[PDB]
Amino acid sequence: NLAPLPPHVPEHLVFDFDMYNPSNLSAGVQEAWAVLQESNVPDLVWTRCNGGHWIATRGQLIREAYEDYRHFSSECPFIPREAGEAYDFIPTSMDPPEQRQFRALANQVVGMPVVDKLENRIQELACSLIESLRPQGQCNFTEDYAEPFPIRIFMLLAGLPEEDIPHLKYLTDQMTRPDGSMTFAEAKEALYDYLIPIIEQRRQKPGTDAISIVANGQVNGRPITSDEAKRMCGLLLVGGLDTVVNFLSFSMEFLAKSPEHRQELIERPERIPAACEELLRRFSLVADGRILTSDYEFHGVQLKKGDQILLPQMLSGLDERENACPMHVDFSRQKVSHTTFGHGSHLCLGQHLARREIIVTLKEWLTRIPDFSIAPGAQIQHKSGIVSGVQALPLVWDPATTKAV
Ligand code: HEM
Ligand SMILES: CC1(C)[C@@H]2CC[C@@]1(C)C(=O)C2
Ligand SMILES: [K+]
């Protein structure tokens, strides 16, 4: 459905892009979003899809808007409006100044010191999952690795049972790529229905897990409230269950389709960290946004108080104004410009965990299964939303070509 054009929006800026079902999706989701960067498309457009909203299409505008929290507020960060209004996770739904105190607590549970110490378990899980698959000569990569590897690490960190994954993953996905059976509000309340009692249990009897540390945490020296803890823990669950999970499939699809890039990383494994960054740019996957706090003229366009603006993190690094030959993957690229982990005061707190999971996956997969391909006759289908992903990724290889370590 196309929402009626608001009085202040001129026809020449209308580009009816649907972030949940973009028309060019068959080409690949990044390609589908990149239609917004054709030379005839303005820097800032209005779509009548999903209730009506602006979209900034270029890295320069995306970065600027993410820096200017006084005009572009995080209070309502998701489209559609109903989703952004219901969205209340911490720290994301807060602007500075109040936002900042909550970042330190989140860093205690997912930041570099936690990741540094989790490294052995991350390494051991990647190796055991991949070794289990290796002799099979095939896998359904999304379900056999992309999901269980990051999700089991997160559930371990959070002290949550692995048998709870299907329910929590389903709810998470309704917040980013809704199937239509739940509104954002309904998915959020179901997630809170799960979390609220666990938070109370761990405030009564603290453990060492992430939920315990959040639930018993302090924020700038005063106790976190149960409500705040719930709102933080909800966000961490979403980061754990619906970010790296998707990104790994884009990366592995790419490697399946490009033998020369596999061979590069096999022959020069020291390039894997750089490769991770270049893949983060090329297969960037997040797009949320902000709400206008006031009427504001931005790059020659009149924005109105309360208008939503999508500021796709995915697009900055695909912008040819930020990186030449942007759809080309070059592991030797010298200035890899992107906003894949966000920009401004909300810069991703999970990015060190994410990079470790990616780098460990690349190293340990290519050691054991150096040569693999997309399954015969398979067409890989992407899906689009707040976080984009890969619906299924069937891979094959000759288990004669694999090595047990
Ligand atoms: C490839 C993986 C990931 C990507 C691309 C990604 C992307 C992002 C982006 C774009 C933002 C900013 C959103 C905004 O400004 O509205 C963000 C924030 C955040 N991310 Fe990540 N993320 C990833 C992994 C993770 C993981 C694994 C976790 C935790 C387990 C996590 C936790 C967070 C948190 C807590 C914030 C909010 C920071 C704040 O609002 O101050 N992320 N992430
Ligand atoms: C946009 C995000 C990737 C970032 C971390 C999880 C996510 C879906 C959010 O709600 C904030
Ligand atoms: K809100």
Numbering used by the authors: 10 to 414
What does the published report state?
The reaction is initiated by the binding of (+)-camphor to the resting state of the enzyme. Substrate binding changes the spin state of the haem iron from low to high and raises its redox potential (Fe3+/Fe2+ couple) by ∼100 mV, which allows the reduction of the enzyme by an electron-transfer system comprising NADH-putidaredoxin reductases and putidaredoxin. Here, two ferric P450cam structures partially complexed with (+)-camphor were determined by X-­ray crystallography at 1.30–1.35 Å resolution, revealing the structures of the substrate-free and substrate-bound forms.
Crystals of ferric P450cam were grown in crystallization buffer con­taining 1 mM (+)-camphor and the crystals grown were soaked in crystallization buffer saturated with (+)-camphor (∼8 mM). The structure of the unsoaked P450cam shows an active site that is partially occupied by (+)-­camphor and a water molecule liganded to the haem iron and rotamers of Thr101. The water molecule bound to the haem iron is 1.56 Å from the C5 atom of (+)-camphor. Hence, the water does not coexist with (+)-camphor in one protein structure, indicating that the crystals are a mixture of (+)-camphor-bound and (+)-camphor-free forms. It was noted that the electron density arising from the keto group of (+)-­camphor was much higher than that of the bound water, suggesting that the (+)-camphor-bound form is the major component and the water-bound form is the minor component. The two rotamers of the Thr101 side chain also showed unequal electron density; the form with the hydroxy group directed toward the peripheral haem 6-­propionate showed much higher electron density than the form with the hydroxy group directed toward Tyr96. Since the (+)-camphor molecule cannot coexist with the water molecule, 35% occupancy of the water molecule is equivalent to 65% occupancy of the (+)-camphor molecule.
